[PDB]
């Protein structure tokens, strides 16, 4: 299993500066050797062999070069240490001992498998130990995607790999919303092109004014034009000179590793469009293509070492499953009367027949030996059919009203990955009931046995039909399937039905309605999710007809195909259509934006090898920016034992084929381990020490050589385009919060660091689940994209936040930003820890005095409006001066979104949000430019129109957000366990109402939350 902690030994966070290590020599002798905790294995083996001469049989030992060390790690792994450059404290040994052995196996191959096991957070040798054929099949067969993706990277060497390593970061649309166009000087943008003249870092600039839609070569050619004009070339020689040279240079962003390698218009590149929004002139670096191509290492992808049937439809039998017995259940016989197994045959969340329960048996004797007969004909079983069962306790001690409670649950696919109907006996280790689950069955929970075999084990037995039963091939289903009522009454209803949100109930009539008109549903493709829920999945005839309709279904937008990947649509053909829609329409930009949800929905796939995981692997292996966050999002949830094997097996394959980026990840993974371990100490053993003693301990520790090498020279996991050089240790500090956050500052090693940022500031926080803040900042970013397309310049600030593991992650620091409170702390105290309302505007008046004042108040009021609407729709309460920040430039933004969707108030049954926005007055003063009667201004009226306009815009896209939350159900986030948690968005967006009743509803809630 994975490590319990990040400590350098089992139960010890910090090795002593000197530690005694048991060395077991090959001649049988044992030598205790005092070693530095930071000592390399090279040094330690050398010192051992010096000491070994003092021991008997020392003339039997070969030279120290002929031996390597082996030991036991905290993951219970018997690891051979070939890469002897590693320091002692970073081996993460179980006990401080090393055995001296002759090395066995391939050096480079074993060193790789340790780097992978390190990056995954799980020893690779475990996958070699799983007897499961589906796992071994996944590990082998997935390499097709790896090799195929690697060939596509070496197809157009070296440009193709330059594209892989430094993909263009471009918007999905070259079109500028016209309010962005007018920020340009008649569509032209001024850019400063820099070139470094060797050797003195001599920086020469050529400032250009050019159209916003100029492609990089056109920008380059214009730079060459500016340079060469002074050299009296002939007019034609200049033409020939521009055409030849323009193709051989590239542009790079000053201060970071983002390059303009592709034919996009300059404004389509995200760095340029942002420069238009913020009004900053882009600083770019011109670079010869050979200079970049030399920096690109060759990605070596090596193939690893491990590289009579009856049809389902001929079975004339009903489905029956035998519940044999359970090993044990933890119930007190005095309080629980009896127990039973409750079963159901499900397709997704919908049951295919009546649920069947076993007879009741005594608690102490959980054995049933009972054949359960189900209301489904075996040929009518859909492919994603699943048995959902649980052991339920019943106590009738409250009267004639019995108590039923779930004890432990487990779900199983009735067909394995080989399209075979399950047969014979099977043992299913059950899962504990989730905290708060009162349902007797858990079909949305993971399907499959609990890897923890120390749990209640329920024995099942499936039927046997004298032969292996296989699901029919697609040709048979289609062939079997092949064997003007549409008035406007029906046409208007079909459109109204498709527009209803995914969480609206679809009545049994409407289910019948869409199915009868399934063919006109083709003429309205977005209705496919609604129609799919209307099929009789317990009828192969209707499913077959549905399969044929899907085979020719028009491709739908990506944001609608994602819904067909959540827990509601388990059928492989439905998902297959969904993945094909993504291959066709999902830009690498949008993929990055929805990368979290696409990783989450992997938990609902029936099998390890599927079309979605292959599409995601290929995309990750051909775009390193996608592949980076594909890694961490998979990585950050390896702690979750419900998927750790699936994600572990996947992370193995990505790491084996991602090329040289694995090395950069190893730097990041190890850099984080030092931070986790250090924070563990600060949070645990030194929890009672003062700020000073901890700060001393902090400065003491990072100064240690192992810490210096680990935490310097790596890529920011928040954004790998930022290089983290040396630590600016004077600026590193532990923050006052009791979770002991770590404010870290690095040097920017880019030669143009002074033009972008010479300091990279990151907050490392151990002890808080950041998945909420990740999702909120993701949602905030999408709301801004919508508002911009509809012409609403609401400046949000979705700063970087990345959960990297169990309640541990990173936050991008926003420079020149201060909480409202930090701004308020200027002239003294008012009341019980409270402050003055006018101080905020008074401060902002000083920061942006003169002509910038109107632009700053405008930026504030625009930025304030977006967060007001965003926090309302998402139900993020408790917004006050501590979690609202304002930049010196005037942009307001919210922080710390730990809990949303009204889950703090769910325990009370009172659904009425009336907390007064504490900072209503303070912000009104700014919007009103300092008026005494703030609410009477015309500017305030403009502010209200933005919020009304922004609110309806999001209401117009309610299906997208509902789907995004729906795709997150398997994450185990506390505020997101059922669709009922997601239903709060239905209330805030007033989807049961009309646009007029909704806006009035909004205006009401704002007034209920008005003056604070």
């Amino acid at each position: 299993p994975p490590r319990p902690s990040s400590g350098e030994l089992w139960g010890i966070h910090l090795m002593p500066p000197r530690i005694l290590v048991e060395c077991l020599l090959p001649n049988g002798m044992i030598v205790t050797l005092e070693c530095l905790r930071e000592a390399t294995l090279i040094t330690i083996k050398h010192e051992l062999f010096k000491e070994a001469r003092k021991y008997p049989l020392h003339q039997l030992l070969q030279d120290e070069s002929s031996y390597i060390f082996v030991s036991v790690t905290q993951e219970a792994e018997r690891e051979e240490f070939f890469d002897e450059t590693r320091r002692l404290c970073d081996l993460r040994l179980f006990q401080p001992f090393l055995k001296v052995i002759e090395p066995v196996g391939n050096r480079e191959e074993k060193i790789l498998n340790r780097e992978i096991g390190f990056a995954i957070g799980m020893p690779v040798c475990e996958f070699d130990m799983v007897k499961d054929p589906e796992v071994q099949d996944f590990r082998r067969n997935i390499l097709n995607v790896c090799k195929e993706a690697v060939d596509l990277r070496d197809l157009n060497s070296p440009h193709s790999r330059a594209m892989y390593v430094y993909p263009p970061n471009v918007e999905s649309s070259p079109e500028l919303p016209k309010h962005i166009y007018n920020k340009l000087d008649k569509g032209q943008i001024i850019v400063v092109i820099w070139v470094i003249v060797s050797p003195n870092n001599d920086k020469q600039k050529y400032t250009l004014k050019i159209n916003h839609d100029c492609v990089p070569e056109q920008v380059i050619a214009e730079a060459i034009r500016k340079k060469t004009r002074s050299m009296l070339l002939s007019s034609e020689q200049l033409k020939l000179c521009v055409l030849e040279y323009q193709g051989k240079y590239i542009l790079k962003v000053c201060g970071c590793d983002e390059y303009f390698l592709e034919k996009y218009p300059l404004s389509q590149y995200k760095y340029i469009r942002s420069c238009i929004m913020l009004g900053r002139m882009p600083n770019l670096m011109l670079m010869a293509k050979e200079s970049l191509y030399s920096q690109l290492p060759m990605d070596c992808f090596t193939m690893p070492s491990y590289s009579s049937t009856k049809s389902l439809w001929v079975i004339n039998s009903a489905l029956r499953i035998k519940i044999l017995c359970a090993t044990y259940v933890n119930v007190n016989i005095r309080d629980i009367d009896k127990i039973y197994v409750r079963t159901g045959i499900y397709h997704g969340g919908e049951p295919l027949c009546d649920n069947v329960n076993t007879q009741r048996v005594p608690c102490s004797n959980p054995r049933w030996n009972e054949w359960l007969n189900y209301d489904i004909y075996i040929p009518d079983l859909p492919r994603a059919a699943r048995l959902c069962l649980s052991i339920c306790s019943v106590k009738g001690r409250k009267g004639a009203k019995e108590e039923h409670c779930p004890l432990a649950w487990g779900n199983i696919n009735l067909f394995d990955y080989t399209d075979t109907l399950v047969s014979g006996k099977m043992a299913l280790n059950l899962w504990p009931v989730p905290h708060g689950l009162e349902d007797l069955l858990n079909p949305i929970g993971v399907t499959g046995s609990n890897p923890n075999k120390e749990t209640p084990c329920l024995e099942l037995e499936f039927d046997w039909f004298s032969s292996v039963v296989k699901f029919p091939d697609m040709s048979v289903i289609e062939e079997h399937a092949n064997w003007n009522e549409l008035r406007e009454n029906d046409k208007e209803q079909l459109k109204a039905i498709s527009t209803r949100d995914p969480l609206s109930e679809i009545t049994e009539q409407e289910k019948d309605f869409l199915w009868s008109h399934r063919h006109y549903c083709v003429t309205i493709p977005e209705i496919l999710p609604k129609l799919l829920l209307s099929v009789k999945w317990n009828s192969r005839d209707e499913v077959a007809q549905m399969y044929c309709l899907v085979k020719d279904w028009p491709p739908i937008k990506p944001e609608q195909a994602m819904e067909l990947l959540d827990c509601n649509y388990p059928d492989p053909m439905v998902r297959g259509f969904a993945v094909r829609c993504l291959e066709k329409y999902l830009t690498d930009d949008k993929l990055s934006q929805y990368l979290i949800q696409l990783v989450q929905v992997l938990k609902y796939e029936q099998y390890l090898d599927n079309l979605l995981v292959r599409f995601l692997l290929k995309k990750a292996l051909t775009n390193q920016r996608i592949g980076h966050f594909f890694f961490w999002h998979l990585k950050s949830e390896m702690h979750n034992k419900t998927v750790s094997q699936r994600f572990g097996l996947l992370l193995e394959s990505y790491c084996r084929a991602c090329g040289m980026y694995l090395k950069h990840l190893n730097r990041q993974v190890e850099a984080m381990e030092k931070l986790i371990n250090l924070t563990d100490i600060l949070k645990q053993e030194k929890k009672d020490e003062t700020q000073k003693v901890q700060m001393k301990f902090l400065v003491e520790q990072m100064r240690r050589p192992d810490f210096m090498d680990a935490l310097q020279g790596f890529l920011s996991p928040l954004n790998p385009a930022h290089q983290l050089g040396n630590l600016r240790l004077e600026e590193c500090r532990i923050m006052s919060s009791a979770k002991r956050p770590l404010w870290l500052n690095w040097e920017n090693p880019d030669i143009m660091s002074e033009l972008l940022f010479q300091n990279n500031e990151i907050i490392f926080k151990n002890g808080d689940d950041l998945r909420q803040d990740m999702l909120t900042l993701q949602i905030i970013r999408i709301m801004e994209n919508i508002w911009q397309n509809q012409g609403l310049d609401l400046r949000m600030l979705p700063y970087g936040c990345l959960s990297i593991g169990d309640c541990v992650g990173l936050i991008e620091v926003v420079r020149n930003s201060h909480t409202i409170m930090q701004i308020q702390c200027k002239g003294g105290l008012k009341g019980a820890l409270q402050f003055n309302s006018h101080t905020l505007h008074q401060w902002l008046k000083d920061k942006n005095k003169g002509e910038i004042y109107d632009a700053a108040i405008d930026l504030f009021t625009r930025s304030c409006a977006g967060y007001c609407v965003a926090t309302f729709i998402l139900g993020i309460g408790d917004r006050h001066n501590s979690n609202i920040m304002v930049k010196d430039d005037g942009q307001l933004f919210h922080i710390d979104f730990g809990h949303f969707l009204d889950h703090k108030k769910k325990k009370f049954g009172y659904k009425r949000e009336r907390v007064p926005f504490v900072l209503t007055q303070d912000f009104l003063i700014v919007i009103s430019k300092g008026a005494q009667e703030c609410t009477k201004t015309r500017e305030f009226e403009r502010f209200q129109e933005m919020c009304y306009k922004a609110y309806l815009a999001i209401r117009q896209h309610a299906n997208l957000f509902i789907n995004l939350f729906s795709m997150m159900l398997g994450s185990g986030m506390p505020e997101l366990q059922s669709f009922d948690d997601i239903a709060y968005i239905r209330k805030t967006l007033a989807l049961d109402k009309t646009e007029q009743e909704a806006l009035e509803y909004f205006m009401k809630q704002m007034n209920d939350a008005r003056h604070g």
Partner: protein, 144 residues
Amino acid sequence: LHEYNTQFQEKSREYDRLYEEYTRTSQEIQMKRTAIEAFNETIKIFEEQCQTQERYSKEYIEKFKREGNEKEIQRIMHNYDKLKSRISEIIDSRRRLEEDLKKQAAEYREIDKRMNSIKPDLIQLRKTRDQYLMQKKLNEWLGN
């Protein structure tokens, strides 16, 4: 409703506390299973070290007896004795953890027993409270 909500909010608080102890105890049990797994692999390595030592000492003890170098034979015996001291010290460490795992794994079953008797009772209290469903006094009676 005041009587039933207070009864509800206590068992709610106790089920939450027990669930914290339950999951916390569960993570600890896994670690003990890990360390026992690591101890087994470590014990296996040391036992090999003893077996290999007897092979090499075999012909040298024979040589050092005949060569009258009794002082060298004590060297080999002293170190071999030092090995067995380490092995016994480590088997004891595994054994104490195995014993420790038994107490926590039994306590673990005891937490899940207490919750699984509180879990159905907690639902019923919601039913009785909800029967009472059909403003200062409403937020007051709900434990505020």
